[PDB]
């Protein structure tokens, strides 16, 4: 074997890409890698998340610590490349900087709207600021951040995330701190919202199938997977990649001998969504990047006796 | 609370070792026509409870188990779909407990969550002629899953596919009481009961552990005799 | 108590869709199935989050110590 024997054979197919999900395919890469190569993207790809939460006041019905992490789970549209890590050894005052940390403030008082068209259920009209939304979090620039983030001010990736509900007289006033962490550290970093793969379902036919069978056969799979060849009436796999591997055929004895269901060997379908912080390929670079950065780091490490 | 007699400002302190929050403070006056200042307060403490290791959970089917480890999500085998399970219950813990309804619920739970429709579990709505297995899997098939509910998955560590499809479903769980934080203790110096100069029950005052005869007997029979004694 | 922010399994952010979900069932009188599918909930992971959900905070909000009846 050799890298060239790989670099020659390895092949990528991008089925689709979106600012949130990008589904692509990786051919001739080897499960030991792709998996590990995957789960770097579920974990160690760092991203910004609120971490330390300072309540000046919570009068809400939601007790603090809940609303604390309930904020923490809120994604942010931020390029973590614009931020730096946070040393824990530093004293708390020094522990945070403008380069370390993004400050988010939240201030809401709930007041009864006197305009309520009495005989109204709707709390939106009954009350003022009854519902607290992600979009309500205010970004407070610090130092250079005032400059830096003028381009793309910090925003919760899903502005309409419902944080808290409030009744008149109740208020919430807080400041939270956003830092870099890896999903491996805590479940709220890695901006996947999921990441995974699967194998091309190598489905193959052991002997021609036609007549009603092909139709019955074709029905046993997701549509469009099984083409029925016209004029031979026989069934042919159109594309397996659409298959969900229900193994439904295996329930029908007639077809049970006629088809084997399998996965191809080295090939992968990556479905990578995102929390919205980064486009998947942007992440997927860091997936590669980090893994490489492990070795290149470790190669340079002296091996102590 | 300031004391007049001792002319001191004294203090009540938080006894429990587990850090709590101040939830509510209730100023309680008294009857008999006022003139009485505040002599009593009740205080809610809020205590965070998370699913620590050692916390009994259960299904509705009577499967009780201790959380063994919070399991790193990347290591939790992940679906063909990309869904890592929330909970992983050993498949061996069945034939002995003879709980089928959990398998059935595992189907229906999934079956519902797909079609978005609630699934009546009322007993004796089925029969040997119409089984739920036949019933729900039929739905799963129409949903495009394995009629048996089994699913292709991949070992989260290796990444390779597991030997066979494994059986996944959506089951309603119940976190119990009896969290480990409530139950354990160690090394009780403090109490040293006055009569016997011996420790005392652990509870929350710093006791110890009773030995007892059946435990004594073992030492003798166990073998660790010098040690035992 | 209140809408979970993320799907436990998926990790996908489910916290916002609730209001719109009720809106769908309410205004559009959809089924439970389509609305979820229309909200873009594919994995039955993230479907159960909204689907099974209870807003029980609503009952809590009915008790407000900070206001007259």
């Amino acid at each position: 074997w050799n890298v060239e024997k790989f670099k020659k054979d390895f092949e990528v197919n991008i089925s689709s890409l979106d600012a949130r999900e990008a589904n692509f395919d990786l051919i001739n890469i080897d499960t030991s890698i792709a998996n590990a190569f995957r789960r770097i993207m579920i974990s160690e790809v760092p991203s910004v998340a609120a971490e330390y939460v300072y309540f000046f006041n919570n009068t809400s019905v939601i007790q603090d610590e809940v609303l604390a992490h309930r904020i923490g789970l809120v994604p942010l549209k931020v390029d973590p490349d614009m931020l730096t890590w946070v040393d824990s050894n530093l004293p708390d005052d020094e522990k945070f900087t403008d380069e370390n940390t993004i400050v988010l403030s939240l201030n809401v008082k709930c007041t009864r709207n006197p305009d309520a068209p009495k005989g109204s259920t709707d709390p939106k009209e009954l009350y003022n600021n009854a519902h607290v939304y992600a979009r309500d979090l205010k970004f407070e620039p610090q130092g250079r951040q005032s400059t830096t983030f003028a381009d793309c001010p910090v925003v919760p990736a899903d502005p309409d995330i419902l944080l808290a509900k409030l009744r008149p007289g109740q208020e919430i006033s807080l400041k939270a701190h956003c830092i870099l962490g890896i999903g491996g550290d805590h479940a709220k970093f890695s901006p996947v919202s999921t990441a995974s793969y699967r194998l091309l379902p190598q489905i193959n036919i052991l002997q021609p199938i036609k007549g009603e069978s092909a139709r019955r056969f074709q029905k046993c799979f997701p549509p469009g997977v099984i083409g029925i060849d016209e004029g031979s009436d026989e069934a042919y796999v159109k594309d397996a990649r659409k298959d969900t591997v229900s193994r439904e055929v295996l329930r029908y004895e007639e077809f049970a001998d006629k088809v084997k269901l399998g996965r191809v060997r080295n090939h992968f379908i990556f479905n990578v969504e995102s929390a919205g912080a980064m486009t998947p390929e942007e992440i997927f670079f860091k997936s590669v990047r980090i893994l490489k950065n492990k070795a290149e780091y470790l190669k340079n490490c002296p091996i102590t006796q | 609370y300031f004391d007049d007699t001792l002319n001191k400002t004294k203090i009540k302190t938080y006894h429990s070792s587990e850090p709590a929050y101040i939830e509510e403070v209730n100023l309680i006056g008294d009857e008999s026509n006022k003139f009485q200042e505040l002599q009593t307060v009740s205080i809610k403490y809020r205590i965070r409870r998370t699913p620590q290791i050692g916390d009994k959970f259960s299904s509705r089917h009577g499967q009780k188990g201790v959380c063994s480890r919070k399991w790193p999500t990347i290591d939790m085998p992940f679906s063909e779909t990309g869904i890592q399970p929330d909970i992983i219950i050993n498949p061996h813990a069945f034939p002995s407990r003879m709980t089928i309804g959990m398998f059935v619920e595992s189907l229906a739970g999934k079956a519902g969550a797909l079609h978005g429709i609630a699934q009546d579990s009322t007993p004796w709505i089925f029969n040997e002629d119409d089984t739920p297995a036949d019933y729900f899997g039929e739905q799963l098939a129409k949903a495009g899953y394995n009629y048996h509910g089994n699913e292709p998955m991949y070992s989260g560590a290796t990444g390779e596919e597991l030997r066979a499809d494994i059986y996944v479903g959506v089951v309603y769980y119940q976190r119990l009481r009896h969290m480990v934080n409530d139950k354990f203790q160690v090394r009780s110096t403090g109490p040293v009961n006055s009569l016997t100069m011996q420790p005392v029950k652990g509870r929350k005052r710093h006791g110890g552990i009773r030995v007892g005869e059946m435990e004594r007997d073992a030492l003798i029979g166990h073998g660790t005799s010098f040690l035992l004694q | 108590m209140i809408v979970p922010v993320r799907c436990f399994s998926c990790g996908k952010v489910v916290g916002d869709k609730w209001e719109s979900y009720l809106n769908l069932l309410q205004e559009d009188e959809l089924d439970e199935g389509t609305a979820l599918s229309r909200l873009g909930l594919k994995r039955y992971c993230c479907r159960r989050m909204i689907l099974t959900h209870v807003d029980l905070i609503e009952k809590f909000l009915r008790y407000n110590p900070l206001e007259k009846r």
Binding site: S15, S16, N23, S196, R198, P222, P223, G224, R241, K242, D243, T244, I269, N271 | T81, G82, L114, H115, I117, D120, I125, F126, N127, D129, D130, Y135, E138, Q139, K142, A143, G144, Y145 | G33, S37, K42, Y44
Partner: peptide, 24 residues
């Protein structure tokens, strides 16, 4: 006895990664 009523109008909710309902 009346058997458990089959829930009518159940389409495919599940689709392989990177596909929609319409594709099928």
């Amino acid at each position: 006895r009346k058997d458990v009523p089959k829930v009518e109008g159940l389409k495919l909710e599940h689709f392989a990664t990177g596909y929609d309902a319409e594709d099928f």
